[PDB]
Amino acid sequence: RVQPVIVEPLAAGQGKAIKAIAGYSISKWEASSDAITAKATNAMSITLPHELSSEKNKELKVGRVLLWLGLLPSVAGRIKACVAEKQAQAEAAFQVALAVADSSKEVVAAMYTDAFRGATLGDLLNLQIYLYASEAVPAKAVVVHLEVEHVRPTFDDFFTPVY
Amino acid sequence: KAIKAIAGYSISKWEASSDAITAKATNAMSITLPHELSSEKNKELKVGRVLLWLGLLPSVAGRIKACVAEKQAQAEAAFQVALAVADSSKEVVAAMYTDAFRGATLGDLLNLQIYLYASEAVPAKAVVVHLEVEHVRPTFDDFFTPVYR
Amino acid sequence: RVQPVIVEPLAAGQGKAIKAIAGYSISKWEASSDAITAKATNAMSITLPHELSSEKNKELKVGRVLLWLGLLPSVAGRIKACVAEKQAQAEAAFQVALAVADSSKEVVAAMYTDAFRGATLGDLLNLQIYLYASEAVPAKAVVVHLEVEHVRPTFDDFFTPVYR
Amino acid sequence: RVQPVIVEPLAAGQGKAIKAIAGYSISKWEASSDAITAKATNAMSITLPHELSSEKNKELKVGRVLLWLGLLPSVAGRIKACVAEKQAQAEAAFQVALAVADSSKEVVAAMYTDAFRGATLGDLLNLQIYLYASEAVPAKAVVVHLEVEHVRPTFDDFFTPVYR
Amino acid sequence: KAIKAIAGYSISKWEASSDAITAKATNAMSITLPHELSSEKNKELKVGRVLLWLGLLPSVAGRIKACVAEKQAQAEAAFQVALAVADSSKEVVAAMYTDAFRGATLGDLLNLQIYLYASEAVPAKAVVVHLEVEHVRPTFDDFFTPVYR
Amino acid sequence: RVQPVIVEPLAAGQGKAIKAIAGYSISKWEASSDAITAKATNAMSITLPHELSSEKNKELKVGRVLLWLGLLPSVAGRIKACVAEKQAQAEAAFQVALAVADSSKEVVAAMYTDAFRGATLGDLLNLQIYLYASEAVPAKAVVVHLEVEHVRPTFDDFFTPVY
Amino acid sequence: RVQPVIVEPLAAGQGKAIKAIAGYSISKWEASSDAITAKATNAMSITLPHELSSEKNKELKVGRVLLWLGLLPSVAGRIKACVAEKQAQAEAAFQVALAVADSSKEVVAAMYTDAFRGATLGDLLNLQIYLYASEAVPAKAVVVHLEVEHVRPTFDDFFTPVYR
Amino acid sequence: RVQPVIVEPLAAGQGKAIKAIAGYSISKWEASSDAITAKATNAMSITLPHELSSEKNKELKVGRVLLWLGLLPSVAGRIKACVAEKQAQAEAAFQVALAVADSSKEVVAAMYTDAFRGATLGDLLNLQIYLYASEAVPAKAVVVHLEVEHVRPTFDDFFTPVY
Amino acid sequence: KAIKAIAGYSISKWEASSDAITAKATNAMSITLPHELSSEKNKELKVGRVLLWLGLLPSVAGRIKACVAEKQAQAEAAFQVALAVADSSKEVVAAMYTDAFRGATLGDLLNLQIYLYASEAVPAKAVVVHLEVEHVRPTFDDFFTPVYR
């Protein structure tokens, strides 16, 4: 039996938001970039924010991480980013990574569901973010957004002891 | 409909800009995780499917091929070993690694490299490679940091 | 009986998210690259983040690791990455490794499910990430994202004790 | 109804002892210091003890880590320590870390509960301990005590087999 | 009554002597675990509350301030970031870190430093810093070592 | 209802002894110190005894550790010790450590309940002990006592095979 | 009542095989030697294989480790090995270690059951293997086999996802 | 009661084959050797095959490993091999190893049941194989067979995606 | 009957050839695992009983003693600390380490050394040392590798 199906169009902003699993929470931070020579990859390092910079919080385990990149409307060309272990040549990181985020697609994002599940935020200090551009891109023209999920920090809802 | 991540996973998506590419040449840039996933706790998360798709400026001309692989002596041989390449001459410029890294660890992606090839001369920041990995959800993303450091 | 089917077109970033198993958490971090000569490889070692650099946290056990690499849109060529134990020749790491992440495909990632299951986080200091580039690729043009899952740290839900 | 209360004065070393959870054990070791210039930091890497240096034991999983530092009574000033992943500038490790152990307080310690839970012991080789001194402090004047908990090693209750 | 360690924990207590301190200066000495806790098995134990209290000779004069923190470029800035300092001018010369390191690992305390400040000139071995950490009990302390090595 | 309470005084030696948890055991060893310059911190390393020096016994997990320091009655000043990871400057180890043992207090000890729980004795080879003194202290004037607990060694009650 | 017994003669390699416990797996690798001066020791560090070198797999927890050493039949003398944390003098590692593998016996092996239980695999990068030779022994004349057990890697039963 | 027992003789090839435990599988590979000077030990490194060389497969946990060495009938002397961690002097590896395989015995093999249980194949890249010979042995005269067991690779029975 | 490995274990058996030995000298060669056990996953396996037995060419003369121990400064002292030696003058040339390494990790055997002693001059490849370790069975030996790399 052939079933008639209507495919309704979507607006830019209508979509199901993926929810963190029970017992975890999501930290969201961004990092601006610098100038990219054409046909060249810059390789920056992941810097945790101050809140997660403590030695207490560098022991929380990691779940899924998400990398979506937001860019100026003035820029043209093709921009591709990923996260990977630090390597000798940066371009080869696009040959090993499990998901790359391409700006030529409809959804400019990369979802890492199992590549870093079970690691630690202190181990996320060891990773790198790789940016590729087809044309010459000036400084601060792309901002990368990375959103990691980790176990909920179990002692951060207390005031500091002063008495 | 789009491909949904399986139950228990999430998808981290990030991009990497390029460098200048000589004609008939291959650059080999390493993979850097974002800051949120760079913790030692989060480098032990397992990896599912990864995706590489590159967006390029429409002014460029030639043929651009990218892949991910392990570190090699010659970069060109990486195009002979890799399980999927993304080609600009083809219909869909993408590379879907469904079983190549499924089971590997998120810290093991630092041992990989992205390989770009250009048939002609390409300036810097002219292509951007988008990669989208999926991994297990981090075990504490629903908690504020403890306020008493 | 033949049964008809309709394949839905799938937008980018619209896949099912893989969840970590019960008792585990996923730590996600990145590493930037340096300049790669044409038809060459580079080996960079995995550095744990500072939060996991404690002696108590170097004894946690590893589940699955995921390497997805993000690259600039300007770079041209074919770039392939993997992880392995450290070797004499780096190129031979592409002959032994269980999964490589080619950039000539639609999913530029590599999922190591049972290659490191049951290993320790300190043993991740003994691994290396290998990049290969088909053309001349400048520095910081690829960034590797590695995402490990590990057992959740047992004491990060408590304040530090106030008495000394 | 208001309910009166009496606060008992507490002598030194008279607190409740935190017990490791079931299936885990606590390994405790120390590291001595070198000379610190005034208003400066020093980064020293964590070295596992030899008993845990095996390949079988570098795959154990980490729970909670505890850094308590012991210092000579002659030294003056303010000394602060933390653990983190290795960074370019060491001072910035005090801006990111989840807990620091100040010496101007009553409990000179720092408890990382969920910062490294689920990491591996080999990943503790990727961490660093950071010391800051407000004044000129000589060598071996502070000693850092780090106490990790990890899964108990599965075969240390058996004699070695007698046949070769 | 004194503060009792919580169920499942024990308290390791040790001391560290000092070095010579210039006037208006800060020394930064690292933390060394004792031998019993220095094993790779025992560096994975979790940490609860830590305590720092310093005993000083009564002949000394001035003002001595100590704390624990992470490693920094300038040592003086460690007194601006640390959550508790121990001051000799105050009523109780102590520093009680209840939530600063609770959850961290016993091997992570090697990444910390003790910071001493003296207002005047202080000779070597004139103050001794006592620190008392609590941690999970080691999983084999009720067994003799196996006699057949 | 106000309840009358009598606070009875204690002698030096009356106190409840903390017991190891089930399945663990306690190894107790001491280490003598050397000369300490005034306002300076010496930083010594932890040496496991011979019984726990085997590769079999460097895999036992660690629970709570205890550091109490015993000193000569002739010495004066103020002495503070702790255990921590090895660092660049030793004095900064008193800013990171979770408990320091002060000789100016009534109980000269430091209890590390969770700082090293789950680590290994081979990882206790990586730690250091930090000593601070206010005045100049000669050699062997302080002996530090550290008492760790670990899992009970499961094969050490056998004679060595000779037949 | 006295009960007679008959002892069966046992051929080489006819012992009971020790099985890893449930949820664990045994990774086995080797390391070759270099030249040893007579009455001397050598310290070589443990390097994890590439499969366990990921950040996700450096957080796995360690059970029992086993060191059995294979040696050429031409070499003469007495050769002893152990594992420990790294020390100043290597010879003192034979005074502290919980088990040594003497070559003057019938079972040339050493079983560390609870020495590293609960440690992390990354913490195996902090350990060292110590060799002692009673006579002049050339290079590559002994090969050490170390066999760790660790938790099984949680994702090595799945293909990598095909979409990028 | 004395019981009469007949000890029946065995042929070279009759013996119970040890079976892998449930959920594991066995990879079997060999490595040829080079020239051995008399009274000297060569120390070669373990190279995983190509099938297990992937970063996906370097995360599988390890069970029991087996080393049996096969040699030419022309060679004479005494040959002893083992596996161990890499060391300063190779001969001392025969003093630490838990089982050495001697060619002078009836069963020329070495069974490592617990020495590497719980490690990883990427950690088996860190080990070494040590060969000893009494007399001078030419190249390729011994081939070492090592047979490891690991968890079964859960995604290797799929074809590669081409559509 | 022979000694059977206990339930859950297997026995890896391998050999190592020798080098040239000066008279009244001791060589110290390190232990190398085979390739199959060299993975980081398999270096975390626990060790039971190990065995060392050496086969020697019948043309050799003198007295050859071997053992396994930790790394030492002097190699001769390894014969004073080791729990079992294999002696060619004795009835059975073997060394059975039943409790010396039982509980240790398979990666810890890289921290050990084999010690050979010869009373006379011995050429290279004249003795071969066989060592047989037992360990837990690797958790995936019943699976083909995933074909989609």
Asked: is B1-149 a CATH 2.30.140.10 domain? The reply is no
Inter-residue contact B102 to B50 (CB < 8 Å): no
Burial environment of residue G23 by CB neighbours within 10 A (0 to 12, 13 to 18, 19 or more): middle
- Backbone φ and ψ for E54, nearest 5 degrees, come out as -110, 135
Residue in A26, A89, A135 nearest the CB of B27: A89
Rounded-to-integer distance, Cα A56 and Cα E145, Å: 33
Q: Torsion angle, CA of B137/B140/B144/B149, rounded to 10 degrees?
A: -140
Chain H residues with CB under 8 Å of I21 CB are: 38-40
Q: Identify the helix (H) or strand (E) that includes residue F105.
A: none
Q: Torsion angle, CA of E42/E47/E51/E54, rounded to 10 degrees?
A: 30
Inter-residue contact G84 to I111 (CB < 8 Å): yes
Task: Determine the distance in angstroms separating the CA of C64 from the nearest CA of chain D, rounded to an integer.
Answer: 12
Contact assignment for D118 to B44 by CB distance below 8 Å: yes
Inter-residue contact I149 to B84 (CB < 8 Å): no
Which residue from C minimizes the CA distance to H50?
A: C96
Find the distance separating the first CA and the last CA of chain H, reported in whole Å.
75
The sign of the torsion formed by the CA atoms of A91, A95, A96, A101 equals positive
Strands (E), chain H: 24-32, 40-45, 62-71, 79-85, 100-102, 109-112, 120, 127-133, 142-151
Inter-residue contact D10 to E49 (CB < 8 Å): no
Rounded-to-integer distance, Cα G27 and Cα G50, Å: 12
Burial environment of residue B91 by CB neighbours within 10 A (0 to 12, 13 to 18, 19 or more): exposed
Rounded-to-integer distance, Cα D65 and Cα A108, Å: 39
Q: Identify the helix (H) or strand (E) that includes residue H121.
A: helix H121-124
Contact assignment for D96 to A52 by CB distance below 8 Å: yes
Rounded-to-integer distance, Cα D113 and Cα D130, Å: 18
Q: What angle do CA B24, B28, B29 make, to 5 degrees?
A: 135
Inter-residue contact F93 to D34 (CB < 8 Å): no
Q: Do chains B and F touch (3 or more CB pairs under 8 A)?
A: no
Rounded-to-integer distance, Cα H104 and Cα H79, Å: 8
- Backbone φ and ψ for D53, nearest 5 degrees, come out as -85, 0
Closest CA to B106 of C52, C101, A85, A129: A85
Rounded-to-integer distance, Cα B23 and Cα F95, Å: 56
Q: Torsion angle, CA of E76/E79/E85/E89, rounded to 10 degrees?
A: 60
For residue C92, give Cα distances in angstroms to B73, B77, C37, C67, C102: 8, 11, 17, 19, 16
Closest CA to G65 of I112, H56, E39: I112
Contact assignment for I99 to F59 by CB distance below 8 Å: no
Rounded-to-integer distance, Cα H149 and Cα H127, Å: 16
Q: Which two tokens stand for residue B102?
A: 């499924």
Neighbors of chain D with 3 or more C-beta pairs under 8 Å = A, B, C, E, F, G, H, I
The residues pairing with F40 across neighbouring beta strands, listed in sequence order, are: F133
Three-state secondary structure call for residue H125: coil
Contact assignment for C161 to E51 by CB distance below 8 Å: yes
Task: Determine the distance in angstroms separating the CA of E114 from the nearest CA of chain A, rounded to an integer.
Answer: 15
Length of chain B: 149
Rounded-to-integer distance, Cα G60 and Cα G116, Å: 13
Compute how many other C-beta atoms are within 10 angstroms of the C-beta atom of residue I62: 17
Inter-residue contact A27 to A69 (CB < 8 Å): no
Rounded-to-integer distance, Cα G65 and Cα I136, Å: 9
Three-state secondary structure call for residue A15: coil
Chain I residues with CB under 8 Å of G154 CB are: none
Rounded-to-integer distance, Cα I132 and Cα G66, Å: 11
The sign of the torsion formed by the CA atoms of B81, B82, B83, B85 equals negative
Compute how many other C-beta atoms are within 10 angstroms of the C-beta atom of residue H13: 5
Three-state secondary structure call for residue E133: strand
Compute how many other C-beta atoms are within 10 angstroms of the C-beta atom of residue E144: 12
Compute how many other C-beta atoms are within 10 angstroms of the C-beta atom of residue A35: 16
Closest CA to B110 of G159, C101, C78, A80: C101
Three-state secondary structure call for residue B110: helix
Rounded-to-integer distance, Cα A19 and Cα C19, Å: 11
Residue in E84, E96, E101 nearest the CB of A56: E101
* DSSP, residue by residue, chain I: --PPBPTBEEEEEEEEE---B-TTEEEEEE----STT-EETBBS-BEEEEEEEEEE-TT--S-EEEEEEE--SSSTTHHHH-S-BEESSSSS--EEESSSSTBBBTTGGGGEEEEEEESS-B-BBBEEEEEEEEEEPPS-SSSPPPS--
The architecture of the domain spanning A1-163 is: Sandwich (2.60)
The residues pairing with H116 across neighbouring beta strands, listed in sequence order, are: G147
Q: Whose structure tokens read 């020390």?
A: G87
Rounded-to-integer distance, Cα F63 and Cα F25, Å: 9
For residue B27, give Cα distances in angstroms to B60, B117, C142, D51: 17, 7, 9, 44
Closest CA to F94 of F139, F119, F129, F59: F129
Inter-residue contact G139 to B27 (CB < 8 Å): no
Q: What angle do CA C43, C58, A21 make, to 5 degrees?
A: 95
Rounded-to-integer distance, Cα C22 and Cα I32, Å: 37
Contact assignment for C59 to D151 by CB distance below 8 Å: yes
Closest CA to I39 of E52, E83, H45: H45
Q: Do chains E and H touch (3 or more CB pairs under 8 A)?
A: no
Q: Which residues contact H50 (CB under 8 A, 6 or more apart)?
A: C95, C96
The sign of the torsion formed by the CA atoms of C90, C92, C97, C101 equals positive
Rounded-to-integer distance, Cα G65 and Cα F120, Å: 13
Contact assignment for F66 to E104 by CB distance below 8 Å: no
Which candidate in I44, I108, I136 is best for mutational testing of the F interface (most F CBs within 10 A)?
I108
The residues pairing with I77 across neighbouring beta strands, listed in sequence order, are: none
Q: Whose structure tokens read 């200091």?
A: C125
Three-state secondary structure call for residue C93: helix
Q: Based on C-alpha coordinates, what's the Rg of chain F?
A: 19
Compute how many other C-beta atoms are within 10 angstroms of the C-beta atom of residue E109: 65
Inter-residue contact G95 to G89 (CB < 8 Å): no
Q: Based on C-alpha coordinates, what's the Rg of chain G?
A: 19
The residues pairing with E52 across neighbouring beta strands, listed in sequence order, are: E95, E131
Three-state secondary structure call for residue H30: strand
Task: Determine the distance in angstroms separating the CA of G91 from the nearest CA of chain D, rounded to an integer.
Answer: 13
Rounded-to-integer distance, Cα A98 and Cα A115, Å: 8
Three-state secondary structure call for residue G93: helix
Closest CA to E114 of D33, F78, D127: D33
Contact assignment for G52 to C116 by CB distance below 8 Å: yes
Neighbors of chain C with 3 or more C-beta pairs under 8 Å = A, B, D, E, F, G, H, I
Rounded-to-integer distance, Cα I44 and Cα I37, Å: 10
Rounded-to-integer distance, Cα G108 and Cα G111, Å: 10
Rounded-to-integer distance, Cα B131 and Cα A69, Å: 10
**Paired sense of beta strands E125-136 and F127-134, if any:** parallel
Asked: is G1-164 a CATH 2.30.29.30 domain? The reply is no
Inter-residue contact H122 to C122 (CB < 8 Å): no
Inter-residue contact G52 to B103 (CB < 8 Å): no
Q: What angle do CA A53, A59, A63 make, to 5 degrees?
A: 100
Rounded-to-integer distance, Cα C138 and Cα C72, Å: 11
Residue in D97, D99, D116 nearest the CB of B41: D116
Compute how many other C-beta atoms are within 10 angstroms of the C-beta atom of residue F160: 16
Q: Whose structure tokens read 């001051």?
A: E87
Q: How many helices (H) and strands (E) does chain E have?
A: 1, 9
Domain range annotation of chain B = 1-149
Contact assignment for D24 to F65 by CB distance below 8 Å: no
Q: Which two tokens stand for residue C134?
A: 């088909």
Rounded-to-integer distance, Cα B113 and Cα C64, Å: 19
Chain B residues with CB under 8 Å of C52 CB are: 39-41, 43-44
Rounded-to-integer distance, Cα I50 and Cα G68, Å: 6
**Paired sense of beta strands C109-112 and A109-112, if any:** unpaired
For residue G124, give Cα distances in angstroms to D132, F41, F102: 29, 30, 35
Rounded-to-integer distance, Cα A25 and Cα A22, Å: 8
Rounded-to-integer distance, Cα E104 and Cα F72, Å: 34
Three-state secondary structure call for residue G117: coil
Which residue from I minimizes the CA distance to B68?
A: I149
In chain B, where does DSSP find H-type helix? 78-81
Inter-residue contact E138 to E45 (CB < 8 Å): yes
Closest CA to I84 of I57, I126, I46, I52: I52
Rounded-to-integer distance, Cα H131 and Cα F120, Å: 32
Closest CA to A41 of B128, F128, G94, C54: B128
Q: Whose structure tokens read 């010396």?
A: I100
Task: Determine the distance in angstroms separating the CA of C7 from the nearest CA of chain H, rounded to an integer.
Answer: 14
| SS3 assignment for chain D | CCCCCCCCCCCCCCCECEECCCCEEEEEEEEECCCECCCEEEEEECCCCHHHCCCCHHHCEEEEEEEEEEECCCCCEEEEEEEEECCCCCHHHHCCCCCCEECECEECEEEECCCCCCCECHHHHHEEEEEEECCCECCCCEEEEEEEEEECCCCCCCCCCCEC
Render the burial of I27-37: b for 16+ CB within 10 Å, e for the rest: bbbbbbbbbbb
**Paired sense of beta strands F101-102 and D77-85, if any:** unpaired
Chain G residues with CB under 8 Å of E44 CB are: 118-120, 123
Q: Whose structure tokens read 């039949």?
A: G73
Q: Which two tokens stand for residue I129?
A: 């040392």
Q: How many helices (H) and strands (E) does chain B have?
A: 1, 9
Rounded-to-integer distance, Cα E28 and Cα E17, Å: 13
Q: Do chains A and B touch (3 or more CB pairs under 8 A)?
A: yes
Render the burial of E65-92: b for 16+ CB within 10 Å, e for the rest: bbbbbbbbbbbbbbbebbbbbbbbeeee
User: How many cross-chain Cβ pairs, E to F, lie less than 8 Å apart?
Assistant: 806
Rounded-to-integer distance, Cα G108 and Cα I86, Å: 9
Inter-residue contact E52 to E94 (CB < 8 Å): yes
Q: Whose structure tokens read 């590549």?
A: A115
The tally of CA atoms less than 13 A away on the side-chain side of residue E29 is 58
Rounded-to-integer distance, Cα B67 and Cα A145, Å: 23
Q: Which residues contact A17 (CB under 8 A, 6 or more apart)?
A: none
Three-state secondary structure call for residue G125: helix
Closest CA to I72 of G138, G85, H88, G125: H88
Closest CA to E68 of E130, E25, E17, E137: E130
